[PDB]
Amino acid sequence: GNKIHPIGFRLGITRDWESRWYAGKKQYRHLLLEDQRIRGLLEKELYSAGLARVDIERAADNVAVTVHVAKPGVVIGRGGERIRVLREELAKLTGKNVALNVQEVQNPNLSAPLVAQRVAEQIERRFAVRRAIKQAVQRVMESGAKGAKVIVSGRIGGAEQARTEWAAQGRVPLHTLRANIDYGFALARTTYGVLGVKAYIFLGEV
Amino acid sequence: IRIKLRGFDHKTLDASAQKIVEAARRSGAQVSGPIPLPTRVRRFTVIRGPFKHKDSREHFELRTHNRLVDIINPNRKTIEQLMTLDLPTGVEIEIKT
Amino acid sequence: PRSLKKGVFVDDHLLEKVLELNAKGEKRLIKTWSRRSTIVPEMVGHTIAVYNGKQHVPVYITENMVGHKLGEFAPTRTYRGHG
Amino acid sequence: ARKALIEKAKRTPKFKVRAYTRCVRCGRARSVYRFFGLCRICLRELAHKGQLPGVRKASW
Amino acid sequence: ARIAGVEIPRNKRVDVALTYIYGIGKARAKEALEKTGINPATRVKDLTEAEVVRLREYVENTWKLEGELRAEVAANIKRLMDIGCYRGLRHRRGLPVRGQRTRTNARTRKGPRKTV
Amino acid sequence: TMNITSKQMEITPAIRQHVADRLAKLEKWQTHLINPHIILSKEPQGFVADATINTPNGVLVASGKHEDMYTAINELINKLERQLNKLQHKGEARRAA
Amino acid sequence: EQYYGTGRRKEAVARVFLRPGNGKVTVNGQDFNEYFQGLVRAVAALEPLRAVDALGHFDAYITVRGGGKSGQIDAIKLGIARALVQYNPDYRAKLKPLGFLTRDARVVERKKYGKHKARRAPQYSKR
Amino acid sequence: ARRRRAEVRQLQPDLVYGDVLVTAFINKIMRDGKKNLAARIFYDACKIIQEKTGQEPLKVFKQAVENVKPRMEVRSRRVGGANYQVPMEVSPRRQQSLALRWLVQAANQRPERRAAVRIAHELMDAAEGKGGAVKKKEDVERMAEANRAYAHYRW
Amino acid sequence: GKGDRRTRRGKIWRGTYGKYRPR
RNA sequence: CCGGGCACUCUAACGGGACUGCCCGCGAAAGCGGGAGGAAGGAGGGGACGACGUCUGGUCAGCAUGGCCCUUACGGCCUGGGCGACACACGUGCUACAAUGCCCACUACAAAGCGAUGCCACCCGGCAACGGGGAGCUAAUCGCAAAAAGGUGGGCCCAGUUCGGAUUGGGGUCUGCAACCCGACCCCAUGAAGCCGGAAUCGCUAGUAAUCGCGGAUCAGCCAUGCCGCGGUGAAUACG
Ligand SMILES: [Mg+2]
Ligand SMILES: [Mg+2]
Ligand SMILES: [Mg+2]
Ligand SMILES: [Mg+2]
Ligand SMILES: [Mg+2]
Ligand SMILES: [Mg+2]
Ligand SMILES: [Mg+2]
Ligand SMILES: [Mg+2]
Ligand SMILES: [Mg+2]
Ligand SMILES: [Mg+2]
Ligand SMILES: [Mg+2]
Ligand SMILES: [Mg+2]
Ligand SMILES: [Mg+2]
Ligand SMILES: [Mg+2]
Ligand SMILES: [Mg+2]
Ligand SMILES: [Mg+2]
Ligand SMILES: [Mg+2]
Ligand SMILES: [Mg+2]
Ligand SMILES: [Mg+2]
Ligand SMILES: [Mg+2]
Ligand SMILES: [Mg+2]
Ligand SMILES: [Mg+2]
Ligand SMILES: [Mg+2]
Ligand SMILES: [Mg+2]
Ligand SMILES: [Mg+2]
Ligand SMILES: [Mg+2]
Ligand SMILES: [Mg+2]
Ligand SMILES: [Mg+2]
Ligand SMILES: [Mg+2]
Ligand SMILES: [Mg+2]
Ligand SMILES: [Mg+2]
Ligand SMILES: [Mg+2]
Ligand SMILES: [Mg+2]
Ligand SMILES: [Mg+2]
Ligand SMILES: [Mg+2]
Ligand SMILES: [Mg+2]
Ligand SMILES: [Mg+2]
Ligand SMILES: [Mg+2]
Ligand SMILES: [Mg+2]
Ligand SMILES: [Mg+2]
Ligand SMILES: [Mg+2]
Ligand SMILES: [Mg+2]
Ligand SMILES: [Mg+2]
Ligand SMILES: [Mg+2]
Ligand SMILES: [Mg+2]
Ligand SMILES: [Mg+2]
Ligand SMILES: [Zn+2]
């Protein structure tokens, strides 16, 4: 085990923090806990909508939870029934002026957090893992990516002897700093244990 | 007539120090240019592994950058258009006299 | 040791029984889990069972042992050498 | 015995000496930082994710 | 056997030579020559007989020394070993007294190694 | 001297003495056995006897495995002997030319 | 009229001010022989002008800040070695081949995890 | 090293005689990077050389260097099944290095209490052909001659 | 040396002050 | 320090800069040696960064998670004790065995950091640890802060010592509800081993090794001589 987090390895060069706000020493932990509590409920709820990233900004007394997603209406609801329902339950935790936006994901098959979750959904549905992994890679490359790599590790197919299966097409240069690489992880929970799913998408250099 | 700007990302800390020494400059009169104060560097060093392997670490830093600006010739025409200011989210302004 | 500016510490709950016995014309065997409590001259002559973590050790208190703590007289580690 | 100990650390104690910091994420008692309320593992986990404002990998 | 019962070394300075007495260190070397007004640099070989008996007298009447200091230190260790306190037991075994670890080291109190 | 570690098992002073008596077979070669260290442990398939020993002419590192623990100890010795006899005689091989 | 150079070493910065005169030298409110009193490495500072015969031609006003006394001394050496160049362009000859008009980047190497120092590794027993 | 030769570090001349060899001698005296002490001991001895013997410290110091340079030495080598002391010529770099090393090492064997006294006196004796330093150079040379019969193994 | 509390050099080592290292 | 100023130093953001680009030569070429310019030259020095895989490596005790197992107890609260035990054995370190040293007094020269029940100037009491006053600083402002080795002068005189600072007696400080087990520090006294270390073995190729001090995280305090950083002084050697 030896590979650096390819997002944490690009914070501030190719990627941008999911919680962007200044805060002095006596407050950092207090807001930081909020973002985590905020994200805990949200990733549970907006799961069914295709959640990808949750940007969080703060000024003073307020906080603007921007949410990117594949199916926007599943968050909004009918006219705004669910989107207003969220801010309601949201302001209980926030205890303050918690705005909430929703953002369209252009191609969900170019978002690594999404293809990872879909793979994890397939293997939970008792799908042929190796064939599934090749499908995801094929869906990402057909959608215009310049390279993709998907990894699935654990009791694949339910065998006692754990195994690591992966597939890749095109270019995934994990050492290149200027290379825009999206990364996402999902956690297929099976009757016999956990399988970890990693997805790499190469969107091009800069 | 003092405005202090603290923030983590220096791209927003500088672009916001520009949009004051530009705004109050036109609105008259004297603005003493943004002075980059030294950065205060919080440091975090942790073992990469969750168990033993004591001799492998990763270095993290949190950078509280600092800027100071003097709008030297106040004029309450400046101290009005600044009241509604489009400062990015990740910046903190302090204003004293 | 403990700052002279502060007081001579006794748990005050152990100390209550000492004075209630002195008045009544003491004594009776006092069970305590107070090793931290200083011996004080009101205790001289009594016998107090001090918990070492396992047993309460009956210790008789004399004139010479007053500045100490009750734990110093109920050792906690059974040891008789090796071999 | 651990979740009963994550709760006992939140309670205020009889004496202010028994105050000890835990992880507000995993309940870890050791290598827990004051600035984050996070242990050294969650610290590296979230920071790698990007969910710590300003925090970045330091190389010099 | 001059002062104070120890024939303190000549050839050396008085402040040094006084330290060759049980109970007089550097701190009491600075003290004894201040009260009796003697240059602490003067060698014992050059003490005037008045300076000697002046330095002898203050030294012996102010502090407990050699023999009597040894008796008290012993008597204190004896009674600690008699009331049966924790510091007493460690003296009844030769084991250390100030909380030090004994799994390793502790060879000053234990003595050179006892092979098994 | 010689140290014996029983990892995640418990053993008697008798078994520790057996190991010392078996390691004594290495004394045959009349070379210095410098801080010999035996590790005993149990896998799901049987016992594992590890050993690290330095001598004036190199190190001995061997691992024995077997259902029966005394046999795993003996397999360890057999591997240790062939390593020691190699360390002691290999230099003799190229005396000519 | 006045002649200035910037001299930097390990963590020392030295601002030298050359002024024609007899040779008196001032470093931080003191005379040279008073500030570097007892240091043998000191005389090495005045060397760039022994390469161009300015032994007593100039006087020295010199500030000093950061690092240690020898790095300051060497920073000074680079300082005046630059002020003479602006006093005469044709001083690269008989100063640049003498290594005087350059600054060595030899600086403390960073402490690194795993090691006791920059490179000194912890002791271990292989067996 | 394996890939290429190593480049000999040039030393800046000292600031009392302008000598690069005098510098290397100071460094050999230097313990714990206390160069100020190192220089002071040498020069302190350069006064003692002058005051016990009225002539040039620089000249005395340099002659004692030539008096400790070993012209040949033995360099081991295993030939078949025997370790042979092969006689070998010493490069001038190494001659210098051995000279300075033995000077200090032999000086610090001396009984004189203050170091600069030991550095002066040893350089005084070695300037004339005496002292444990020059002995060490003679001893090494006699070893090389004693083994001239093995001089054909030289590499 | 540094292990000697009763000297300045020992107090510099410990990181404390006293009669043998005043403030 | 006031006036005045951004020159300089600095601070911190954006750039320029080095490419075998030029010259000499060997080359089929790629490159190699040598030269000039230059602050830097052939990856400029250090960093971050670790391929498919290996060790059925490590971690169910950071977290997650399959399954097996406990349910007035294999769960939960508490007081106390233990994790600090000590015939021994190994690993890592600290301090040393002294004069290129030890002590005292005086006197310079850093960097990176940290600091609103926090950092504490300065005053007073105490030999001191520290205590009582009390100003400043949301901190390039005020503070921790003295850097130490070094420099000057004086003591020591080769001795188990003015080396070494273990061990123990007695007396105090402080944190803390509480220092018996089991805290750090101060003061008096005690003043051990150790006279440079067998077999064997570690590190380091340049601002490195060696040596000197400073800071931080954890933290009421602290068993830190540990760890992660920071600068000061500053070597030896590489035939192969
Ligand atoms: Mg380590
Ligand atoms: Mg239990
Ligand atoms: Mg749990
Ligand atoms: Mg605590
Ligand atoms: Mg904690
Ligand atoms: Mg004495
Ligand atoms: Mg202890
Ligand atoms: Mg103990
Ligand atoms: Mg053993
Ligand atoms: Mg066992
Ligand atoms: Mg193994
Ligand atoms: Mg056999
Ligand atoms: Mg800088
Ligand atoms: Mg001078
Ligand atoms: Mg260093
Ligand atoms: Mg190791
Ligand atoms: Mg040498
Ligand atoms: Mg010799
Ligand atoms: Mg001769
Ligand atoms: Mg001493
Ligand atoms: Mg300018
Ligand atoms: Mg080349
Ligand atoms: Mg690379
Ligand atoms: Mg678990
Ligand atoms: Mg489990
Ligand atoms: Mg089942
Ligand atoms: Mg306990
Ligand atoms: Mg433990
Ligand atoms: Mg044993
Ligand atoms: Mg041993
Ligand atoms: Mg240690
Ligand atoms: Mg050791
Ligand atoms: Mg050491
Ligand atoms: Mg701190
Ligand atoms: Mg002695
Ligand atoms: Mg002896
Ligand atoms: Mg002594
Ligand atoms: Mg005591
Ligand atoms: Mg305690
Ligand atoms: Mg001696
Ligand atoms: Mg030494
Ligand atoms: Mg050997
Ligand atoms: Mg190398
Ligand atoms: Mg030293
Ligand atoms: Mg420190
Ligand atoms: Mg602390
Ligand atoms: Zn955690």
CATH numbers and ranges of domains, chain E: 1-71 (1.10.8.50), 72-116 (4.10.910.10)
| Chain F CA closest to residue G125 | F54
Instruction: Give CA–CA dist G32/G23, Å, rounded.
Output: 11
Instruction: Give CA–CA dist A80/A98, Å, rounded.
Output: 16
State yes or no: D42 annotated in a binding site: yes
CATH label of the domain that carries residue A188: 3.30.1140.32
CB contact under 8 A, C62 and E83: yes
Tokens of A153: 């590790």
Contact H141, H70 (CB under 8 A): yes
C-alpha F13, offset from chain centre: 18
Instruction: Give CA–CA dist A182/A200, Å, rounded.
Output: 6
Please tell me the distance in Å from D26's CA to the nearest CA on chain A.
Answer: 12
- The answer to whether H37 CB is within 7 Å of strand J is yes
| Chain B CA closest to residue A16 | B9
- Which ligand sits nearest to residue E106's alpha carbon? 8
- Residues of C with Cβ-Cβ distance to E79 under 8 angstroms: 64
Instruction: Give CA–CA dist A55/C78, Å, rounded.
Output: 62
SS (H, E, C) chain C: CCCCCCCCCCCCHHHHHHHHHHHHCCCCCEEECCCCCECCHHHCCCEEEEECCCCEEEEECCCCCCCCEHHHHCCCCCCCCCC
**CB-based burial, E51-62: b 16+ in 10 Å, e otherwise:** beebbbebbeee
Ligand 44 centroid to residue H39 C-alpha, Å:
19
SS (H, E, C) chain D: CCHHHHHHCCCCCCCHHHCCCCCCCCCCCCCECCCCCCEHHHHHHHHHHCCCCCCEECCC
Q: Is residue A4 part of a domain?
A: no
- Strands of I1-23, DSSP E: none
Of C64, C69, C80, C82, which to mutate for an interface test with E (greatest number of E Cβ within 10 Å)?
Answer: C64
Instruction: Give CA–CA dist E114/E100, Å, rounded.
Output: 19
- Phi, psi angles (nearest 5°) of residue G65: -165, 125
| H/E run at residue F71 | helix F69-89
Instruction: Give CA–CA dist H52/H58, Å, rounded.
Output: 14
Residues 11-70 of C with CB under 7 A from strand J: 33-36, 51-54, 67-69
Contact A187, A116 (CB under 8 A): no
Please tell me which chains touch A, using 3 or more CB pairs under 8 Å as the contact test: B, D
Please tell me the distance in Å from G104's CA to the nearest CA on chain B.
Answer: 26
| Residue type for position H79 | V
Tokens of C4: 């002279």
Q: What are the strands of the beta sheet with A193-205, ordered from one edge?
A: A163-170, A147-154, A193-205, A179-190
Place of tokens 């090389």: H144
| Residue type for position C78 | T
Instruction: Give CA–CA dist F89/F77, Å, rounded.
Output: 18
| Chain C CA closest to residue E83 | C65
Helices (H), chain A: 28-45, 73-76, 81-94, 112-124, 129-142
Contact A58, A68 (CB under 8 A): no
CATH class of G1-127: alpha beta
| H/E run at residue H35 | helix H35-52
CATH numbers and ranges of domains, chain C: 8-83 (3.30.860.10)
Residue of A54, B86, G99, A86 whose CA lies nearest to H10: G99
Which residue gives the smallest C-alpha to C1' distance to J80? C53
Residues 14-53 of D with CB under 7 A from strand J: 14-21, 23, 25-28, 31-35, 39, 41-42, 45
- The answer to whether D57 CB is within 7 Å of strand J is yes
Contact G13, G66 (CB under 8 A): yes
Residues 4-63 of G with CB under 7 A from strand J: 4, 6, 8-13, 15, 28, 35, 37-39, 41
SS (H, E, C) H76-144: EEEECCEEEEEEEECCHHHHHHHHHHHHHHHHCCCCCCCHHHHHHHHHHHHHHCCHHHHHHHHHHHHHH
State yes or no: D40 annotated in a binding site: no
Ligand 4 centroid to residue C69 C-alpha, Å:
25
CB contact under 8 A, G114 and B45: no
Bridge partners of residue H78, in order along the sequence? H83
Which residues 17-56 of B are in CB contact (within 8 Å) with G?
45, 55-56
Q: Which CATH number fits domain F1-90: 3.40.50.2300, 3.30.160.100, 1.20.200.10, 3.40.50.300?
A: 3.30.160.100
The CA dihedral of H105, H111, H115, H117, to the nearest 10 degrees, is -110
CATH label of the domain that carries residue B55: 3.30.70.600
Burial class (CB in 10 A: 0-12, 13-18, 19+), F10: exposed
SS (H, E, C) H49-94: HHHHCCCCHHHHHHHHHHCCCCCEEEEEEEECCEEEEEEEECCHHH
Place of tokens 């580690």: C77
- The answer to whether A79 CB is within 7 Å of strand J is no
Nucleotides of J under 7 A from a protein CB: 8-14, 37-40, 44-51, 53-54, 56-59, 61-67, 75-97, 99-105, 108-117, 127-130, 138-140, 147-152, 155-158, 161-193, 199-220, 223, 225, 227-240
A vs B: CB pairs below 8 A? 18
- The answer to whether E84 CB is within 7 Å of strand J is no
Residue of G83, G75, G73, G80 whose CA lies nearest to G103: G75
Instruction: Give CA–CA dist A32/D24, Å, rounded.
Output: 10
- Residues of D with Cβ-Cβ distance to B9 under 8 angstroms: 54
Instruction: Give CA–CA dist A86/A43, Å, rounded.
Output: 12
- The answer to whether C4 CB is within 7 Å of strand J is yes
Experimental method: X-ray
C-alpha distances in Å from residue B22, one per residue of A97, C6, F60: 31, 63, 76
Chains I and B touch (3+ CB pairs under 8 A): no
Question: What is the phi-psi region of residue C31: left when phi exceeds 0, alpha when psi lies from -120 to 50, beta otherwise?
Answer: beta
Please tell me the distance in Å from G72's CA to the nearest CA on chain F.
Answer: 51
Which residue gives the smallest C-alpha to C1' distance to J49? A175
Contact A156, A190 (CB under 8 A): no
**By three-state DSSP, how is residue B94 classified?**
strand
| H/E run at residue E67 | helix E66-83
Contact B39, B8 (CB under 8 A): no
State yes or no: D26 annotated in a binding site: yes
Protein CA I17 to sugar C1' J223 (Å): 19
Residues whose CB is less than 8 angstroms from the CB of residue A50 and which lie 6 or more positions away in sequence, other chains included: A69, A70, A71, A74, A105, A108, A114, A117
When divided into structural domains, chain B yields a total of 1
Contact G84, G91 (CB under 8 A): yes
Instruction: Give CA–CA dist E74/E88, Å, rounded.
Output: 12
Tell me, which fold does domain D1-60 have in CATH? 30s Ribosomal Protein S14; Chain N (4.10.830)
| Residue type for position A4 | I
**By three-state DSSP, how is residue G104 classified?**
coil
Instruction: Give CA–CA dist A17/G92, Å, rounded.
Output: 52
Residue of F9, F81, F74 whose CA lies nearest to F43: F9
- A145 and A102, same structural domain? no
Is residue E99 within 8 angstroms of chain C, CB to CB?
A: no
Residue of D46, B12, D34 whose CA lies nearest to A57: B12
CB contact under 8 A, E84 and C73: yes
Tokens of G19: 């002024």
Within a 10 A sphere around the Cβ of D41, how many other Cβ atoms?
19
Own/partner contacts of F42-49, CB < 8 Å, gap of 24 or more, are F42/F8, F42/F9, F46/F72, F47/F72, F48/F72, F49/F73, F49/F75, F49/F76
- Resolution of the solved structure (Å): 2.3
Is residue B4 within 8 angstroms of chain A, CB to CB?
A: no
Domain that holds residue B74: 1-97
Residues whose CB is less than 8 angstroms from the CB of residue G71 and which lie 6 or more positions away in sequence, other chains included: G9, G10, G11, G12
CB contact under 8 A, B58 and D44: yes
Which residues 54-83 of A are in CB contact (within 8 Å) with B?
57-59, 64
Interface of G with F (CB under 8 A): 126-127
- The answer to whether D1 CB is within 7 Å of strand J is yes
In this structure, what DSSP letter does residue A11 have?
B
Give the count of alpha carbons within 13 A of B18, CB side only: 7
C-alpha B85, offset from chain centre: 14
Protein CA E31 to sugar C1' J128 (Å): 16
- Phi, psi angles (nearest 5°) of residue D50: 115, 5
State yes or no: D39 annotated in a binding site: yes
Nucleotide lying nearest to G5, CA to C1' measure: J8
Within a 10 A sphere around the Cβ of G38, how many other Cβ atoms?
9
Burial class (CB in 10 A: 0-12, 13-18, 19+), H66: exposed
Pairing type for strands A193-205 and A147-154 reads antiparallel
CA-angle at B65, arms to B61 and B70, nearest 5°:
175
